[PDB]
Amino acid sequence: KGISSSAIPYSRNAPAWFKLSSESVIEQIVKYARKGLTPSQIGVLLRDAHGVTQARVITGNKIMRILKSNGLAPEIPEDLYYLIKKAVSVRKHLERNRKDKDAKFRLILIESRIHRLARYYRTVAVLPPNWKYE
């Protein structure tokens, strides 16, 4: 296993070429989220197009905070959502052709990786306990 990560800069009064305001950023963010875009995708879209560095350093607060602050928050965290729907897609594929024991092994690993952050999220209680795999 190796490293593949972004290295956010030492600057935090970013970025001094930013002509744009700090309210149109929040406007674009709520536009994209009520268009139905996950936090990662709204971040990358306004990173590329309406070029921000990151909204946590242009606005004073991260985008999950401003999504909750504008009443648009998710009901499950993004990672658990993506990993759940990956689990249901691999389950649908194995249900279609049940001989794929490699998909069985991968499904065991995917469900274990579900249970990891599931019990993490129960211990921190972002989504409430009694919760076990929808």
Binding site: R34, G36, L37, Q41, P74, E75, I76
Partner: peptide
């Protein structure tokens, strides 16, 4: 393109309206 038909609480509002109207 990569919009979602899930994942948001206003989307659980629209789908509870769905699951009570149907």
């Amino acid at each position: 393109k990569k919009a979602k038909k899930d994942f948001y609480r206003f989307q659980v509002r629209e789908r509870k309206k769905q699951e009570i109207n149907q």
